[PDB]
Amino acid sequence: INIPTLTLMEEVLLMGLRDREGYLSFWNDSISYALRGCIIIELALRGKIRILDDSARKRFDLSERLIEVIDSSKTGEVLLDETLQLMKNDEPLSISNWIDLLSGETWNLLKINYQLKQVRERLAKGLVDKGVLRTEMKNFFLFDMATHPIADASCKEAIKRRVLSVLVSRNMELSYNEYFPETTSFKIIRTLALICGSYGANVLENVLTTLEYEKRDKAISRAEEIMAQFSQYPFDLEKETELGVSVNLNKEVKEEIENNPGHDLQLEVIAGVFEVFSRMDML
Amino acid sequence: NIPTLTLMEEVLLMGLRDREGYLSFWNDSISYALRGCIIIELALRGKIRILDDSARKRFDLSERLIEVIDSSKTGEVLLDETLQLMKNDEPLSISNWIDLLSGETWNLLKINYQLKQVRERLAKGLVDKGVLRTEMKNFFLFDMATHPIADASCKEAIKRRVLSVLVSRNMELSYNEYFPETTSFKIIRTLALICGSYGANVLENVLTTLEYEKRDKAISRAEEIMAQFSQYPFDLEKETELGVSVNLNKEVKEEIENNPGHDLQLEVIAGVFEVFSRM
Amino acid sequence: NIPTLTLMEEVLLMGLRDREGYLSFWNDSISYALRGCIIIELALRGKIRILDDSARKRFDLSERLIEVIDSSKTGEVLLDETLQLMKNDEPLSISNWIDLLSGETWNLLKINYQLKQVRERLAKGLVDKGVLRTEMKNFFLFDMATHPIADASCKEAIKRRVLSVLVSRNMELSYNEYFPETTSFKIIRTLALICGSYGANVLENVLTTLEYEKRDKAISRAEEIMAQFSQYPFDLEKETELGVSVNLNKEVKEEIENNPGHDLQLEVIAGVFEVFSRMDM
Amino acid sequence: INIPTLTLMEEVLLMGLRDREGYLSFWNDSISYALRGCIIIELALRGKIRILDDSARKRFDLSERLIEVIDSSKTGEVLLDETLQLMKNDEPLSISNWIDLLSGETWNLLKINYQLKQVRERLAKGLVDKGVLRTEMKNFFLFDMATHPIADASCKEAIKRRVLSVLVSRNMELSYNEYFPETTSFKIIRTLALICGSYGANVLENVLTTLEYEKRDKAISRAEEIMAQFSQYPFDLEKETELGVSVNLNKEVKEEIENNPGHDLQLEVIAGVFEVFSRMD
């Protein structure tokens, strides 16, 4: 009711999905990794984790700070739940340390089973069961493959429109649908999450390509600004943009945080993940 | 005595490009024709024969009943699966068998023995025999087993055999590991390929590079041989105005003479040829 | 009047991201599609033509043989290399060539026919033409040359063409230094961009921002064109019920009425377009 | 026989990568400078150089002392061999001097192709030849590129373990492997050399990021101590650590030198480089 229908993991997949012949969409070591960022961002907004409140942490990069489990009760998201399981039964590890373990970018034989298998297909069963995707068989010469064509095109359309509202509107005014109601906690935070996630996942640009290039360039930049601003805690909400895009982002984000108080330890985790998204070139 | 690939496998190959991917989308023309192949194959392996009544003659070839001669395993899954059903049943006609195994007739009591998972099972066959290999392609929302081809010469052999029968004026089939010199009914088997792969509509797939006059002559040579060999006894008297295959008669007469007392089998293979032309 | 980029260049550009282009999606589809482009290009340049034997008409366009009518160097390494191959071989079919040039065939005496270094040479092209600069990015154990984009207006103009055919009620193409109102078969070349692009699965790339209905309409209009022009002579009399580029027919007809004499060349084009159609396989 | 598979400079470079693919570091002047130090520490350790046995030296900082080539026979290690070759055919220079020369920080008109170049690339080839990573072609959208993901992942774990064994655990029990056998001479010095090389190079923190905060800090301090300690000669194996980490160091190092006798002219050089490591800004 305050948690929206789709997980950020799902939204990013959609940002990657083609309209026609979607199994032929581009899958790569980037999207895969960024979905793990997402898993942790998500768990943060859901109040399951927070950074460990040790003032020592302030001497270390945001992405290297340890986090702890506030709350280990099932979310109903299989992907989230399973990582929550791993987290419950272990010492506090750092954000990138978790993102790495869950992606198996890490190489200690000790924590082999920490890596999440079947993300794409479980993410797609989710998209199917939620009605965003259909399921139909295409018969190739030697086999049939299950195909998951878009069932509801209006779903991704709103995702896209939220991005556009933040990266091309001069004034961010966000549209709410059944999937993403006005009564959604941290709605802008979550939109900024989706953008940065998509950016790291290397699918942000997909959503802008029809625009004239000045507008596409500006958008990319805007995202990069947002990524700077929100990849440090407390968020700099004072650096007004020189770009003339979402000129109201600071006022609204401020208000959003104001109305949603005493959550900094969770908002910090997010700047952490946002930091990780910045350093994704290094894969 | 027995070749490595079953005709069913040979026809499947005929549907694929030389490397990865395919030519025909898997339609149910090919699917039916493959069943025909099983029945010929069974007849060639001396497992089945045309029911040795003379009352059979009041009826077209494909309306004639077959009787299990020999129910011992073949080693080929699809083949054995059909032998299974056949041993446990009335003598049924060629036509009917083909229909039942394709599931293009309807029978209430006959517990439904359309052959499921054919194409996918033939695939496995072809992997296990080293024709096809298995490649893991990562797609956006799942992973996928794929089978691009492993041994290209296998297809060359088949192509060359086919073109030996329908472009060159003198047939001299060539032999290899898969299809050795010592194979029983060598020529009847490549005719069966040609005829099967014709109703399957995959025959043209090998003609695609030939000079245009050769393409027409091959296509019409095919249907020529395709009616010679769908009546019984086989007409090995009538020769051809086309400049192809001109020794096929001599050579089939000689192939049969050397392999005596199988008439009750060839007749089945003929009746299957009949279903091919009728499709 | 031959425009500045090859159709292969334009296809590559359709698949090229704005930032970190070197991480754009590469794959067998775009790769094979580049070859069909080569053939189209050659027919558009008077270098090849359909082998003028009526026996052909009993068969599919894509399987009709083509012949070298003018083997003089073209000035494009890729086009030219394939002209050398063609010049000194017997007549071979449209799909047979694309197969040979794409590596797609297991033929003994012709493994050497495969054009290697195609991407590299193509970026060389887009550099020497000023669409792409060239700049070193430093990783840890090495440095790689990247070619970020120098002139964004190039892909833009291409994009605006596709959009003019695929979303405007009335197509009205626009010209630039690269693609002048001067140029031969302006519309065919466009339809070629589109159909080639679609075969490469890089068509929908440019339509992403559009409202989902306009987008969906755009793809199926693209499919109309695909069938319309993958038979010869072109079906220029069947009109469209999507109410988009409703004048395409009138305009192609005019484009063909002016510039007569290349019947045997246009056919090659329709042949390649047929290959484009069968690309799922 | 008693010299290990990897050079410290391979090991320092290895500290620079992420476990499977990717990097933790953008290449830079620090890692570069340190690797030259490494070349020396190594050349000393191999009985290829001593300090020049002169009294005047004691009036001079360890790094401004001259070094003498006691032998110049090929090491098999290509960077060592080239710098050995420069050293052979030259007058004794300060250790600090060579590092500068070798990394091209100073300029000498008599000696202007003295800087080791194509370091990275040669270093990786080594690492590939030795089995410690492999080589995958990646097919980006405009070119091919040869990359080098880790092959043997345990090699780099062995190392993290050693470093960690002296900078984090209370007692120190070095854990030996196929790459770094128990029979390798100056087992513990080299471990220390790595720790110091790493530090100068700014890749030491990379092995530490996963730990608890106290552990991270204590590790860094302990490495700084170790550095202070072994940048003077003879080593103060008397100074005791109040950090409660790696408390058996002295005893073991003592025991270690007490097992390699008559190598003081070498070991001194080592201190001379440790001194250079801790003067990088």
From Swiss-Prot, chain D:
Included range, full protein: 62 to 342 of 345
Function: Phosphatidylinositol-4-phosphate-binding protein that links Golgi membranes to the cytoskeleton and may participate in the tensile force required for vesicle budding from the Golgi. Thereby, may play a role in Golgi membrane trafficking and could indirectly give its flattened shape to the Golgi apparatus. May also bind to the coatomer to regulate Golgi membrane trafficking. May play a role in anterograde transport from the Golgi to the plasma membrane and regulate secretion.
One Gene Ontology term of the molecular function aspect: enzyme binding
Family the entry assigns: Belongs to the GOLPH3/VPS74 family.
Record keyword Phosphoprotein present: yes
Impact after mutating W27A: Abolishes phosphoinositide binding and Golgi localization
Outcome (variant: R36A): Abolishes phosphoinositide binding and Golgi localization
Organism of this sequence: Saccharomyces cerevisiae (strain ATCC 204508 / S288c) (Baker's yeast)
Note: Present with 1850 molecules/cell in log phase SD medium.
Name listed for the protein in its UniProt record: Vacuolar protein sorting-associated protein 74
BP GO terms, sorted: endoplasmic reticulum unfolded protein response; Golgi organization; Golgi to plasma membrane protein transport; Golgi vesicle budding; protein N-linked glycosylation; protein O-linked mannosylation; protein retention in Golgi apparatus; regulation of phosphatidylinositol dephosphorylation
Top-level taxon of origin: Eukaryota
Subcellular compartments: Golgi apparatus, Golgi stack membrane
GO cellular component: cytoplasm; cytosol; Golgi apparatus; Golgi cisterna; Golgi cisterna membrane; Golgi medial cisterna; Golgi membrane; nucleus
Effect of R120A: Abolishes phosphoinositide binding and Golgi localization
Sites where the protein binds a 1,2-diacyl-sn-glycero-3-phospho-(1D-myo-inositol 4-phosphate): W27, R36, K117, R120
Keywords associated with the record: Golgi apparatus, Lipid-binding, Membrane, Phosphoprotein, Protein transport, Transport
Its membrane topology: Peripheral membrane protein
Main location: Golgi
Subunit details: Homotetramer. Interacts with coatomer complex. May interact with ARF1.
Region (Beta-hairpin required for oligomerization): 136-147
